[PDB]
Design a protein around this ligand. Sequence first.
Ligand SMILES: [Zn+2]
Lengths: 196, 175, 98, 1111, 54
Amino acid sequence: ALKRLKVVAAFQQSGNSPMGMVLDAVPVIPPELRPMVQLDGGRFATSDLNDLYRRVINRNNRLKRLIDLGAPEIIVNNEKRMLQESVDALFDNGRRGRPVTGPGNRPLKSLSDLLKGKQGRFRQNLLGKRVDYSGRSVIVVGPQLKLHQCGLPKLMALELFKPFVMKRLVDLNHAQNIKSAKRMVERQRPQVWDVL
Amino acid sequence: QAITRAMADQARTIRIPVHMVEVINKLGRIQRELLQDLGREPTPEELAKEMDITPEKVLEIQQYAREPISLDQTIGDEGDSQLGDFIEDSEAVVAVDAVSFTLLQDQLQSVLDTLSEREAGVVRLRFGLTDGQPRTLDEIGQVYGVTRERIRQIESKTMSKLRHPSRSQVLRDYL
Amino acid sequence: GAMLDVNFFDELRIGLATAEDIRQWSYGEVKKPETINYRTLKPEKDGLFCEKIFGPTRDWECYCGKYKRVRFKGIICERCGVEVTRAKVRRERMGHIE
Amino acid sequence: NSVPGAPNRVSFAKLREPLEVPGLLDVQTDSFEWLIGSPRWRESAAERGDVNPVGGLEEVLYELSPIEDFSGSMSLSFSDPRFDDVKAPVDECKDKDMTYAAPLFVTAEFINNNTGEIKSQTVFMGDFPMMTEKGTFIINGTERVVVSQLVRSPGVYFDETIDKSTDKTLHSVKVIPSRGAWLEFDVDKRDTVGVRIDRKRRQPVTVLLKALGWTSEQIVERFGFSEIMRSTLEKDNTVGTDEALLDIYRKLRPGEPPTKESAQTLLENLFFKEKRYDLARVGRYKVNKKLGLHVGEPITSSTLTEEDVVATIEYLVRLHEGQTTMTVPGGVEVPVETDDIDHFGNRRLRTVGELIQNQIRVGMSRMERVVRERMTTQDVEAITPQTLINIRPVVAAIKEFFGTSQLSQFMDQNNPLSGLTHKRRLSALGPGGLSRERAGLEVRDVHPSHYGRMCPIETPEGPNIGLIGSLSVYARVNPFGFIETPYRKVVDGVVSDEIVYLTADEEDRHVVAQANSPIDADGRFVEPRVLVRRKAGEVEYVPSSEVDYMDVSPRQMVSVATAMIPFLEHDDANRALMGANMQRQAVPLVRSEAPLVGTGMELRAAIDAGDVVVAEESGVIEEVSADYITVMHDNGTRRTYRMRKFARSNHGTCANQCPIVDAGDRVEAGQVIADGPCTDDGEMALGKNLLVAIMPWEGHNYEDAIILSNRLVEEDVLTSIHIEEHEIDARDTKLGAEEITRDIPNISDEVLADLDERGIVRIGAEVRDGDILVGKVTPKGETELTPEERLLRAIFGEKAREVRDTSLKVPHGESGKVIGIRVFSREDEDELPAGVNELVRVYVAQKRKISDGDKLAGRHGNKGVIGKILPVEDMPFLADGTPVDIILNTHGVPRRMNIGQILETHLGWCAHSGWKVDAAKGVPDWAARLPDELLEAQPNAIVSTPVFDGAQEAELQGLLSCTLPNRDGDVLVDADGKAMLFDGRSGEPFPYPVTVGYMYIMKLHHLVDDKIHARSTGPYSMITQQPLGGKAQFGGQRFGEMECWAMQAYGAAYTLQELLTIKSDDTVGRVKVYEAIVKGENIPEPGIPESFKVLLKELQSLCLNVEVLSS
Amino acid sequence: DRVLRGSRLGAVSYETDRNHDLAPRQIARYRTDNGEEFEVPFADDAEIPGTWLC
Ligand SMILES: [Zn+2]
């Protein structure tokens, strides 16, 4: 009774209703979050959600056809069970039964698999991101430096400080505008070190 | 009939119609039966003379018969990364063309403002620099109260004045 | 609560979505399992990618081609159906399946 | 000796070698010619076991044939595989990007049963990728190597467990086949015996016995000694074979209406019928060896047996009762013991022949399914084998094995040693083996049965420790897949010369002596007690009459790469691991000088790697050029060997070959005739000899950094050549066709200087990062133009320029000459893919000198980046005038336990300056066991210390004490190995003497030019709007959770906010911060990142009503 | 494994975003058979269709 009273009190205290646990209308994620992108040479790339949405839409249209046609209970109940399994595999793949596989026998990536684990949104894109204005190299020892100094190679420093050097070598009239200044920086004409 | 028709209608992501699915299957069977007899893969010329079509048509059919790959397979075999994070967004804001466009609009506003008012208004209404709507020659002539030949002569003279290098150098570097 | 996502936040409340919330979020019902026409590569009508439901693909440029400027903004093309606005509304508009 | 064109390398070894080293690619070549059925394998198996010579293809065809339909009306049979000749040679296949194959023909036969007809035909079964002379496949122009695989062999595996609470010993059996269904046994905390078959719950085993058809009288008759078995027969609560059969049917198959005949034949069809259950020939041999069911009978009918099941239960119940031996009725007795699943008599080696044979069998199953499908649909009397057989799944199975598998890897060629040690590798992970995340620490250890079958040293040091090993030097592979090793047979205290190959089981059975023990010149031992190796891996002291085997040599345990470290037994094992892993990352220099002190495993590892041209028959050289040698043989004929000149390897180095003969010489068969990348006069040479000092110098060599001299940049000592390639292709898109031509859209004339009349650059033109390599211009069409660009076009009169330029430009940081342009075309009938009309590849080569940031290493695991390249005048010079060339730090030697480098340094100085031991008043007593003609040596004498039998410390002290002076009377290095260096910068001498000598260091492929990248603004991702990652792109750095915690711990909030918003995701904010930086204004405040709005759309799409409130 | 560059099937225009002078519009009002009403903004020089897909 305690373990029942948890969820019964949860549905009782708020303005929630328990009727939202069944569905009459699945929503569809917008088409820029499940893109169809044409590669270099006519190869396409889809994002595995179009297959799950296509299976839901196919089975729902077939069910509408069977109901408005008039079919026996075995066929209609099998169609309803198939529609239920399709929506379950859309919301969470591999939860009840076998996962729905694609080509090469790998499981498809459903909606709940965008959120869990180390590959999910919360750990892969919301907390740790790639950043601009950054670079790597391999460190060596600098025993003539002071404690507040580091050596930076000039080829990395030019690429990091490119907008500042573009502004400064436009203002010193080495170039006329941003386009010619960027061309001068990328060709590395020897005024750019004195600006840098 | 129902099973094969629905398999044609639903088996593919980008839907291919039934007649093109028929000719794709026929081309596949022809290519397989020719490959068995030849001991080699048949050329498009041999396939085209077998199926009574052109090699360009054979290439178009083999172009249409390709299925998409998925964005979610881990193309790093260590599993750390997937394919959808290795694709350059080739239609994004390049972050230097936007500031270059803003500076171009600033410079064009300056050079247009260093002219006479009637000529500047004629150029702005002719090329649609006011509100993005280009205006017709008789429309400019109507709103400025002169004839269309006078308007186009003023436009030609102003275009010469802008084409002169004294006003034209600072925009000549932009293009 | 507002949904324009300007930076005036106090809360972030999560609840349990009802059907009358889902068919109030949505912008139209997707009712065909089609994505893209195989020859011309344009998004099919009432499909998973339909511009009438999810907005236009080209910035301020409608589908059939009748209106193509920033002068026309928020107008509905009475032949094809797409409204004319930016192409970044294809990451912000949802549909629903009945 | 034994190689005719050899450099005379005097050895310090004191033991005679009874067995020469085998061919180092016989792990690969013998397995693949077994799979083919080649006559060389046929005669080898003829002289070693000719009762059943069957190749892999004949075995697959026999275990498939014959295919019958459901009614048995007709049958199809295969027989006699046969290969044609290779359609294109090796260099042509490597150049034209076509695979290296040979056609396969199978004589099919279709038999009609009731009527009586045979339709024998000949069917083409695709093209089979053949193996070259060096154990490498060639797939689509590249060179691929299929590594071996360690898998656990099928058999029966008794093991014991001890209960936590009751502390009873619980025993268990698993019998594990290939492709079958598992069945186990148990003894629980009570006195019951589980039978948990196909991962089901539990039953008493008497239920399974009754379902097999055994009465309770039969069970008490057979298992009369077993209190457990008679107790479970009392507690079985089930009589009736049909009732027990229905019980196991209900426990096994849930939800099916049980019928009598299906319930009866379910267990029989699951286990004893060969379609659904087959432990292989290896598994049948292992079961017969363990239980003792058959001895003399050859292996056939490899399904299970009820006799095998009852003998397994008998073995389990006697092991639980506590017996030590057991006789199966009908066979010889065996000992009773539990099994270890990491013993090397239980881990078989699934080599390249067995891997390709498995893929062929997988393809043939999918072929025979459609054969028995289409056999019945179309009518009889009209079918033929060529209409029955569809070879598409077979050829697709072979192609999908050779591409896109994790056992068919890219060949790792930086040098001959890396090429050799990428083969002879036993990777324990793959399809059919354990994964990386779920691999326990039990399987990653060194079992004591690896002595001579694996190397304890050489493993990858990353997150793959112990999961990837390498074969030992003398090891072989059984017909089944067990790893043998040779031993000398000693008969009654006399060591003979007959050599017996013993696998791990026989090595556990016998007792094996040690290699460096005093033979008394005929075979007798000298001391009356001999150090041995016993059964369980223990080491004892056994008198010299129970000894019945002896090792062939020391360094039998070590691998190929670990056999080239001098003074290995003085290093620690971690540093030996690092040395053996860094020896195969060296780059080929332009000069390739042989080492002054090496081991013996250098000439053999060079001529067996394959990158050295070796004369086939003896003759006299007729003409030498830099491209060919033509030997004139002893009988008329002549043969011209071409050379690979400046050909790119897989990893971007150079693969030059240059002759080392004269135009009138005489050669013998097997003699080295042309060098390779990393060889010198025949033998391996990965680095240069550099004069070293072991002092700490002014902090520039602090914590493993290294200071060089400028002489190594001036004289091009450590200089390598690296070759890139670039590829563009002109296909036909929707709006037109792309065009490769020099008529580029809007661009200056001066950038079109080096380009020729038709696009591509001229050969020899120096390029730079941004230049045009191939001018390709794509059609664009007509789009909308802005009014501002419309006004500019109307001002300056240019047209719209309807085609868009997408050329090929050399990426950032690259330069160097253009070597060659390889251009394919559609019009020359070249096999380009669908759509491609023209493909052009441009090779750009640059010559990289040594620089700070480049990484150097020795042989004993002492790596380190180069800190500073001093000029040649401020280096510590000797008293004679010679400057030193590197300065290694001295704080990294004692705490890392690698004084192999100090002993190599001392012996390098002795071998450089030469010696002469004064044998006037007899030989001195340090050199009593030195060989002859090591008592004197000229300067630059190459010596050799083998691995575990080398130069001793007393011999090193003596040779250090008696060297010979340079040019004047001056011994620069006194008896301790130390010299009195001056200081080239302040002038004064150093106050204490410093160790100097000659050390052999090599340049590693972790160069500073390939590692540096930077990014201000580049490409962005697709779904989320974050920057891309990797140096192949522009690529940004990753700022993860731990760096966010460090920033929060500092308290910098604004740094964190601008790192997570206006540098990654604020799409309207990145352009504003760029224009504010360019105009010089203030940076604007950030906005909401894009990934949060993507998160809200996903949460709303999961039927959750996430709404952000306001106040 | 590669440096793959792909584009979605659309083009980005970039003009100014102004909101002071726009083309004139007038709002139609469609009601379904559910008893629910929807409003769609058409153009002034545009014929109002009788049935609209809401
Ligand atoms: Zn329209």
